[PDB]
Each structure stands twice: as structure tokens, then as C-alpha cells.
Amino acid sequence: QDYKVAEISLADWGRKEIAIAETEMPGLMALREEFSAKKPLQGARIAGCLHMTIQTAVLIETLVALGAEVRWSSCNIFSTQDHAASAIAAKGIPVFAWKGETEEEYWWCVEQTLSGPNGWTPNLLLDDGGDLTQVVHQKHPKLLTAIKGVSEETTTGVARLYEMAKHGQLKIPAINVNNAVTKSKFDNLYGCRESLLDGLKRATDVMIAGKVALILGYGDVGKGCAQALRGQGATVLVAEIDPICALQAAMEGYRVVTLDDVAEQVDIVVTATGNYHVVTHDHMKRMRNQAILCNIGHFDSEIDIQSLKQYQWENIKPQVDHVIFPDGKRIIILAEGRLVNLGCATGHPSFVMSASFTNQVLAQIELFQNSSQYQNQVYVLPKVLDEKVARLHLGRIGAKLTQLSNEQADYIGVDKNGPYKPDHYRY
Amino acid sequence: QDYKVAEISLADWGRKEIAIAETEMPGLMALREEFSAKKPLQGARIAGCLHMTIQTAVLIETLVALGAEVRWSSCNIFSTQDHAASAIAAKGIPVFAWKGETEEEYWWCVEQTLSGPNGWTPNLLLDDGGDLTQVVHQKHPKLLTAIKGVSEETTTGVARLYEMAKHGQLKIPAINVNNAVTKSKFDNLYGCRESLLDGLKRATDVMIAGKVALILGYGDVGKGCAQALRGQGATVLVAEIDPICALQAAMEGYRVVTLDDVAEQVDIVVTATGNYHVVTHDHMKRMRNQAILCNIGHFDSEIDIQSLKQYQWENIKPQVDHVIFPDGKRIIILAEGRLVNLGCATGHPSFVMSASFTNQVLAQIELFQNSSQYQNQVYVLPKVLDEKVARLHLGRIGAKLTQLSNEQADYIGVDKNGPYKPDHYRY
Ligand SMILES: NC(=O)c1ccc[n+]([C@@H]2O[C@H](COP(=O)([O-])OP(=O)(O)OC[C@H]3O[C@@H](n4cnc5c(N)ncnc54)[C@H](O)[C@@H]3O)[C@@H](O)[C@H]2O)c1
Ligand SMILES: NC(=O)c1ccc[n+]([C@@H]2O[C@H](COP(=O)([O-])OP(=O)(O)OC[C@H]3O[C@@H](n4cnc5c(N)ncnc54)[C@H](O)[C@@H]3O)[C@@H](O)[C@H]2O)c1
Numbered sequence: 143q144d145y146k147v148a149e150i151s152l153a154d155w156g157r158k159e160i161a162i163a164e165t166e167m168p169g170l171m172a173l174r175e176e177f178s179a180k181k182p183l184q185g186a187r188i189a190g191c192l193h194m195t196i197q198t199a200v201l202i203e204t205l206v207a208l209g210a211e212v213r214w215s216s217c218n219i220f221s222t223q224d225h226a227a228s229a230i231a232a233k234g235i236p237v238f239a240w241k242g243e244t245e246e247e248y249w250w251c252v253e254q255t256l257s258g259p260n261g262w263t264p265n266l267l268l269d270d271g272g273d274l275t276q277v278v279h280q281k282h283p284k285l286l287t288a289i290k291g292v293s294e295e296t297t298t299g300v301a302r303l304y305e306m307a308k309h310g311q312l313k314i315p316a317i318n319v320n321n322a323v324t325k326s327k328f329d330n331l332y333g334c335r336e337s338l339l340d341g342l343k344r345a346t347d348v349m350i351a352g353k354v355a356l357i358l359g360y361g362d363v364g365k366g367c368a369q370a371l372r373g374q375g376a377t378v379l380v381a382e383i384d385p386i387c388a389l390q391a392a393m394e395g396y397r398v399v400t401l402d403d404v405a406e407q408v409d410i411v412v413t414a415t416g417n418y419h420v421v422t423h424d425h426m427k428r429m430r431n432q433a434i435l436c437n438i439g440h441f442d443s444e445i446d447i448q449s450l451k452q453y454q455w456e457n458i459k460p461q462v463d464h465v466i467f468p469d470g471k472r473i474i475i476l477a478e479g480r481l482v483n484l485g486c487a488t489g490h491p492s493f494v495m496s497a498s499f500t501n502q503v504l505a506q507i508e509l510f511q512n513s514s515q516y517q518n519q520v521y522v523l524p525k526v527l528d529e530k531v532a533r534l535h536l537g538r539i540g541a542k543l544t545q546l547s548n549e550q551a552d553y554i555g556v557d558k559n560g561p562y563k564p565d566h567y568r569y
Numbered sequence: 570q571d572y573k574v575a576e577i578s579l580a581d582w583g584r585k586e587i588a589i590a591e592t593e594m595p596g597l598m599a600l601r602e603e604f605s606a607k608k609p610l611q612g613a614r615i616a617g618c619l620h621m622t623i624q625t626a627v628l629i630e631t632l633v634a635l636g637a638e639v640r641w642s643s644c645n646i647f648s649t650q651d652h653a654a655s656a657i658a659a660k661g662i663p664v665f666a667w668k669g670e671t672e673e674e675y676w677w678c679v680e681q682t683l684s685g686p687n688g689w690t691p692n693l694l695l696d697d698g699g700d701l702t703q704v705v706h707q708k709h710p711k712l713l714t715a716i717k718g719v720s721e722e723t724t725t726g727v728a729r730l731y732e733m734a735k736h737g738q739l740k741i742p743a744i745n746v747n748n749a750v751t752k753s754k755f756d757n758l759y760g761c762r763e764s765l766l767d768g769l770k771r772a773t774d775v776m777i778a779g780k781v782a783l784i785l786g787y788g789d790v791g792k793g794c795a796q797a798l799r800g801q802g803a804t805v806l807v808a809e810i811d812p813i814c815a816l817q818a819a820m821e822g823y824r825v826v827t828l829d830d831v832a833e834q835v836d837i838v839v840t841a842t843g844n845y846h847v848v849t850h851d852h853m854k855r856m857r858n859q860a861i862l863c864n865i866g867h868f869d870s871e872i873d874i875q876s877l878k879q880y881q882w883e884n885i886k887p888q889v890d891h892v893i894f895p896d897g898k899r900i901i902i903l904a905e906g907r908l909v910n911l912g913c914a915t916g917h918p919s920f921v922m923s924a925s926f927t928n929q930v931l932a933q934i935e936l937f938q939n940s941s942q943y944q945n946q947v948y949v950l951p952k953v954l955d956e957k958v959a960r961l962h963l964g965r966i967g968a969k970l971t972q973l974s975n976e977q978a979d980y981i982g983v984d985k986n987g988p989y990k991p992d993h994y995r996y
């Protein structure tokens with residue numbers, strides 16, 4: 143068995159939910175319709191490290207339908223949906239993923255992606271957060287020569303690529319999928335607008351209405367989180383280091399504050415910074431009894447979880463814990479500080495993941511075919527492909543596009559078929 | 570008298586409202602505090618073409634406080650606030666602007682900006698919409714040699730610059746002020762979110778709640794217009810040619826439709842496209858009795874106003890007209906299709922105009938000092954200045970910034986003092 147999952151008998155349930163998800167993921171299904179016969183990824187050998195959800199199962203089966211061979215792992219110890227992993231394993235696709243991995247198991251799973259039976263090695267990487275990219279660069283430099291490139295899903299992974307490139311550590315081309323407009327402005331924003339609430343509601347019976355909620359970070363994720371909680375009746379506070387993002391939050395009516403000032407005043411804290419130790423021991427010591435602390439950024443290091451190691455952790459249910467302080471005060475920590483929407487719920491819904499994952503497939507096609515055209519730098523896909531991703535999703539939600547006339551296209555200086563915006567337009 | 574205004578005796582009223590506006594415009598006042606003694610614009614001779622409002626009066630007096638000499642005109646026949654123009658004229662600043670200009674008067678006013686007494690000619694242009702840039706390039710090529718550059722306020726003006734540059738027609742450097750983040754994502758969005766309603770409410774006693782409103786265009790302006798009307802209880806429809814913007818609108822719950830389909834169904838139509846004849850004769854013929862038609866894009870050519878020339882126009886009050894069709898059906902047209910927020914109300918409020926106009930002052934300083942470093946292309950100001958503009962506005966609205974620690978700045982790859990985002994970050 144060239145796989146490792148929790149329970150293979152969950153595969154039928156996984157197939158049933160994959161069938162539903164396909165009907166919500168028109169971008170991926172359109173790529174199958176366009177490319178499954180020509181098989182543009184025939185000869186592609188993709189090592190993948192990305193949350194092993196039902197939506198990712200549709201991504202994997204799209205890559206395979208286009209001719210790729212893949213080996214898969216999750217990029218978080220809690221984000222796997224076991225029945226999705228089983229459905230993939232039952233297809234004979236190598237997948238190494240279960241919910242509740244230890245850290246040792248996590249890195250073992252990544253490692254299994256880099257070598258398969260009969261001398262299988264990847265020539266492509268598909269990464270979400272930079273861990274797979276790190277393992278290959280730091281532990282398997284011999285593999286790098288054969289890797290055509292990496293496509294990277296998320297803001298933190300791209301930040302890690304930028305720092306590698308600045309220091310001459312990046313040894314392959316990288317496609318930044320996060321900053322396709324149809325990824326960053328949809329998945330990060332509208333996805334979290336729904337899936338933060340999902341994680342909070344599944345974890346506890348805390349009401350949102352009337353609570354004071356603090357969001358740390360007002361980028362794409364924090365913007366979606368703030369809209370989510372404000373719509374449900376919370377008073378929303380925002381912390382920011384960036385004066386432009388702070389000004390955006392203020393102009394939406396949120397008070398912009400520091401956690402150093404407001405720790406005792408908040409009912410719910412959500413870290414969405416992509417940064418390091420933005421919630422410290424002293425912050426948590428000051429929090430009210432039964433305050434809820436969670437992280438929706440990529441890494442649990444947004445919170446100094448280590449500082450709680452000597453306190454009693456009383457489990458409430460899976461991925462919901464009380465941390466009991468010496469004076470008896472308790473805080474509720476979700477998923478041990480790991481990604482709350484994937485650890486306490488199921489991540490983003492299928493429709494917006496289709497937009498993200500359509501970009502991933504297009505990036506893998508571009509790297510597999512044309513990686514010779516790229517240097518060891520970070521690139522984004524062209525705007526015409528970004529627009530194509532959007533076009534493929536309009537039919538499902540019933541949006542009807544207006545067509546420019548010749549004179550209207552000339553008036554604003556565009557081709558009738560796009561691209562319709564200048565390169566650095568911000569949407 | 571080196572000026573032309575409607576009534577100089579309105580100057581005292583203008584001064585009173587300028588004094589209030591200063592307290593809402595901390596960016597401009599901060600630039601006065603930083604630069605009025607060093608006078609970095611001493612020797613600058615600025616021809617300006619930008620809506621002659623109270624807020625623009627604060628911009629003009631900031632330029633003058635920094636040492637500039639200016640000659641001013643409005644960029645729209647209806648956008649001048651006469652008491653603001655009088656306050657400027659009473660200071661001895663040449664201004665040629667009144668509400669209700671004819672087209673001949675409009676272009677005469679622009680022309681007055683290009684030559685003053687004693688051989689005064691500009692060495693800088695400050696433009697909003699591209700009309701001043703057009704006049705100089707097409708009618709006064711001898712002036713071009715002495716023009717160090719132009720700073721351009723709005724999306725349509727930048728579109729015109731791009732097309733000039735593509736065809737080799739741009740003969741001076743241009744700073745695109747519209748696409749400072751602290752302009753496009755604030756003025757265009759939050760400004761119109763307030764000032765569209767202002768124009769509609771001052772013009773008619775039409776209720777927004779329960780109406781079906783169609784917004785043509787879902788860029789920065791259309792996004793703000795949609796939020797405005799949705800918050801007041803309208804059913805909001807959106808038309809788009811851009812599939813990414815269409816998908817954004819759909820994900821906010823707006824049905825994305827074509828005016829060709831829905832003309833008979835709408836109560837209010839707002840053009841926000843920057844394009845040509847997006848509302849045609851047949852659209853207007855199909856509109857319901859007493860439907861309200863207005864334009865918030867830069868030019869009245871969004872609507873084919875010419876097609877209504879043979880119908881009786883019955884005036885309701887200034888800038889509010891009935892167009893009476895042969896079957897007796899009437900539509901309400903606002904400001905003859907000119908910018909509705911400035912024609913039927915007073916434009917954006919002071920606070921957000923401060924952010925836009927702080928960018929304008931910084932652009933004029935950069936052109937006056939460093940235009941030799943630029944070619945005849947379109948440029949944007951650097952991100953550190955964009956962040957500075959935001960910083961200068963945080964105090965007024967009580968936003969408190971968090972400061973990165975050394976390790977947090979290193980973790981995300983930024984300097985503690987910024988810039989905090991990659992060059993092409995979209996906010
Ligand atoms: N949970 C999900 O489904 C999901 C989806 C996309 C991205 N992410 C992750 O979420 C994180 C945020 O992503 P993003 O796209 O919003 O990034 P972003 O860069 O757009 O936003 C992060 C924001 O945090 C702010 N910030 C940084 N340090 C801070 C501090 N100490 N205090 C306060 N604010 C601070 C920055 O100024 C920035 O505006 C990343 O780790 C990303 O990988 C999660
Ligand atoms: N009234 C104000 O205070 C104010 C402020 C800023 C800008 N403006 C003006 O408003 C206009 C829009 O500015 P913006 O920043 O939103 O520009 P933008 O480019 O961001 O948005 C315009 C949108 O219109 C869409 N569009 C173009 N042709 C269309 C058509 N035929 N049908 C439907 N949609 C169409 C485009 O796809 C685009 O998304 C410009 O003329 C700009 O100069 C006015």
C-alpha cells in the first residue's frame with residue numbers, strides 16, 4: 143500500500159462529497175473538459191503539500207485527469223479530511239495524510255512525497271505554506287536539479303520565497319498563485335468570511351452577537367474575518383502595523399487598537415497576521431475567563447503556544463481545549479493555535495476553492511511546459527489567465543457579462559477580449 | 570482683476586467653510602507644517618484644472634503656502650462651489666471658475682490658466698480628467714518644453730495618458746495620482762459611497778429603500794456606489810465587462826446583468842464605467858416613467874445625451890430636469906449627465922479629499938524637484954509616500970498603529986518603518 147490514511151473504508155463517503163463538490167467547482171471541471179484528452183501534464187510528476195480536503199481531492203483528480211502523476215501530503219497536522227484522503231487513496235493515488243498528525247508524522251508525510259516506488263521522483267512541486275519547498279531546498283538539494291518549479295498557494299509561502307530569492311537561496315522558478323486576483327481577492331477574503339465562522343461555531347456554543355472581537359491583521363484574510371463577525375453582531379476591533387490597512391479598517395467603522403492595550407476587553411481573538419508571536423504569554427494572562435483564542439494565519443507561531451506548556455490543558459472535545467491558569471482563569475484555545483477554519487471545520491467552501499485551484503492547475507501546466515523560460519525568481523501568471531479563471535466561474539452563479547463594442551474597447555484602450563485592466567490594477 | 574468668479578462677496582462664507590475643512594484635512598495641514606518654511610515649491614508655476622470646491626481651496630492654499638504660484642480652473646462645468654472660488658479669488662490667486670459654465674466658458678477658463686500677466690507661464694500641470702493635458706499637447710506645443718510634468722487625479726485622465734504614451738503623443742512626464750493606494754482605494758471607493766447618495770438625495774425626494782438600482786461598472790467607484798445603495802435598502806444590480814470585477818460583485822450578493830436586458834426593470838441608473846455611450850437612446854426609451862438617470866464617471870459621454878435633444882426638457886430645479894418623451898413618459902436626468910456627486914451636491918467630504926490631495930502635493934514636489942529623472946511616461950509615487958499619506962490621516966480618526974518588533978519585521982521581510990507590502994500588493 144503506497145499510501146497512509148486513517149481509515150480506507152471512509153472512501154465511499156469521500157466519493158459522495160467529491161461528486162457534490164464537482165458541481166460547485168466549474169473551473170476545475172472546465173479544465174478537465176478542455177485538457178483531459180490532450181493531457182498537457184503527461185510526464186508531470188507532482189509532489190504536493192496542501193490541505194487534504196474534499197476540495198483538494200477535486201484538484202488532485204484534475205491534475206491526474208490531465209495526465210500527471212502525483213504524491214500528496216497535507217500542509218497542516220489538523221487540516222486533512224480523512225474521508226477525502228481515503229477517496230484519493232482508493233483511486234491508487236499516493237497520499238500520506240490524516241487528521242491529527244504528530245509533528246514527526248507531518249514531516250514524514252512530506253518526505254514520502256519526494257520518492258516513490260520504481261525510482262519515482264517529482265519534477266514539479268505544489269506547495270501551500272513553503273514547507274515542501276523548504277524540505278527540498280534544505281534536505282534534498284540533489285532533487286532540485288530535476289524540479290522544473292514550484293507553484294505556491296498562500297501569502298506566508300510567498301513571503302518565504304521572497305526572502306529566499308533576496309538571499310540567493312531560491313534554486314527553482316516559483317509561480318505565486320496566491321496573488322492571482324482570482325485567488326487573493328476571493329479565497330483569502332470571501333473564503334475566510336465564511337470559514338472563520340464555521341470554525342468558531344463548530345468549536346463552541348459562543349454567540350457572536352454582542353461580543354467584542356479583535357482581529358490581528360487587516361490584509362485579505364483579516365478583511366474577510368472582520369466582515370464575517372461584524373455581520374453577526376460583534377463589535378469588531380482591528381490591530382495593524384500597516385498604516386494603509388489600518389486606514390482601510392477605520393474607514394469601515396472598526397476601531398484600530400493594539401492588543402497591548404485591549405487584552406482585558408476582548409471576548410474573541412483571531413490572529414490573521416502571518417507574523418510571529420503576535421499573541422504573547424502576557425496577553426493570554428490578561429484575557430478574560432473563557433475568552434476564545436484562535437489563529438487563521440498559516441502557522442501556529444502567531445501565538446506563543448510554548449508559553450502555556452506548564453499549565454493544565456483540559457480537553458473539551460477534539461481541537462477544543464481549556465488552558466487553566468494558576469489563578470483558575472481559563473481560556474479556550476482552538477486547534478492548539480493551528481489554522482482554525484481547517485482544524486475546527488472543513489476550510490473554505492468548494493466554489494471559491496475552485497478559483498484558487500484552477501490557478502494552481504494553470505500554473506502547473508505553465509511550469510511543466512515552459513519552465514525553461516523562467517529564472518530562479520517569483521512570477522505571477524498573466525492577467526488573461528486570471529480573467530479566464532473568473533470567466534469559468536460566472537455561469538455557476540448566474541452572472542451575465544456585458545460585451546464591449548468596438549468603440550467602447552477603443553475608448554478605454556483595451557481589446558474586446560481583454561485583458562481589461564492595467565497590469566498593476568488593484569481591483 | 571486677474572480672476573473670474575460668479576460673486577466675489579461669497580468669499581466670507583467660503584473662508585468659514587475652508588476653516589472647518591482644514592480641521593478635516595490633516596494630510597494637507599501636516600504638509601504645511603513640514604514644508605511651509607522651506608518652501609519646496611518656490612519657483613513652481615502650476616496650471617491646475619480640478620473641481621473648484623472647498624476641499625480644492627485647501628489644496629490650492631497648501632500649494633501656495635509651500636511657495637507655488639498657481640492659476641486655477643475647474644474640470645467640470647457644474648462642479649465649482651462659487652463661495653470656494655470667491656475665497657480663492659479674494660486671496661489674489663488667479664481662479665477662473667463658476668458653477669454652470671457653458672462649454673465655451675469652460676475651455677476659456679482652462680486657457681486662462683496657461684498665461685498670466687507679466688509673461689507668466691506654467692512649468693507644472695495639475696490635471697483631473699486630462700482636459701488640461703489635452704489643451705497643452707494639442708493647442709500649445711510651445712508650452713510643453715517648459716512643462717516639467719503633469720500629475721493626474723482620476724482614472725479617466727490616466728487612461729488618456731496611457732493611450733497618449735502608447736502612441737508616442739505624451740511629451741512630458743506624468744505622475745498617476747489616481748493609483749496611489751491612498752487615493753484609488755479611499756477617494757474613489759469611500760468618497761463615492763457617501764457622495765453618490767448626497768447627489769441623489771439633494772436632487773430628488775426619491776427613496777432609496779425598495780428601489781431597483783443598476784450600477785454600470787464595478788471598479789472602485791462602482792463598488793462604493795453599490796455599497797451605498799445596498800446599505801439604504803435598494804436591490805442593487807451591477808453590469809460589468811470585466812469578468813473579475815463581475816465575479817467580485819456576484820460574491821457580494823449583487824446580480825450581474827446587462828442594461829440591454831433590464832432597462833424596463835430599474836428605478837435608478839448610475840453610470841460608473843469611464844466608458845462611452847453605455848446608456849443609449851433605446852435604453853432611455855425603455856425606462857419606466859420617473860426613472861432616475863445619473864452619471865458618476867468623469868465625462869457625460871457615458872450617456873448619449875445628444876439623442877435627447879429633440880425632446881422637451883422641463884427643468885425641475887437647478888441640475889434636475891425632466892426629459893419628456895413623445896408618449897408622455899418622463900425620465901429624471903441629473904446634472905445633464907455630468908458628474909452627479911459634484912453637480913447635484915458638493916463632491917466627496919473633506920477627510921478623504923485630504924488623502925487624495927496630499928498625494929497631489931507630494932507629486933508636485935517630486936516633479937518640480939526631480940522631473941529630470943523621469944522620461945515621458947506614466948509613473949506612480951513610491952510606496953513609502955503612500956504609507957506616509959495614510960499615517961498622516963490616522964490621528965484624526967483615532968487609529969492606533971501597532972509597532973513591529975525586530976523579530977517580527979524580520980519574520981515577514983520588512984523594515985520596521987516600512988514599506989510593509991510588496992510593490993504589487995493590492996490591499
Ligand atoms: N485560513 C485560510 O484559509 C487562509 C487563507 C489564505 C491565507 N491564509 C494565511 O493567513 C495569513 C494572512 O494572509 P493575508 O493574505 O491576509 O496576508 P496579508 O499580508 O494580506 O495580511 C496580513 C496583514 O497582517 C498585518 N500584520 C503583520 N504583522 C502584524 C502585527 N504584528 N500586528 C498586526 N498586524 C500585523 C500586515 O500589515 C498585513 O496587512 C497568512 O499566513 C496566509 O498564509 C490563511
Ligand atoms: N465622481 C467621483 O467623485 C469620481 C471619483 C473617482 C473617479 N471617478 C471617475 O469614475 C469613473 C470610474 O472610475 P473607477 O476608478 O471606478 O474606474 P475603474 O476602471 O476602476 O472602474 C470602471 C469599471 O467599468 C467597467 N466597464 C467599462 N466599460 C463598461 C461597460 N460598457 N459596461 C459595464 N462596465 C463597464 C470596467 O470593467 C471597470 O471595472 C472614471 O471616469 C473616473 O475618472 C469619479
Ligand SMILES: Nc1ncnc2[nH]cnc12
Pocket residue numbers: 192193194195196197198333484488489490491495
Ligand atoms: N477547503 C479547503 N481545501 C483546501 N485548502 C483550503 N484552504 C482553505 N480552505 C481550504
Ligand SMILES: Nc1ncnc2[nH]cnc12
Pocket residue numbers: 619620621622623624625760911915916917918922
Ligand atoms: N469635494 C471634492 N473636491 C474636489 N474634487 C472632488 N472630487 C470628488 N469630490 C471632490
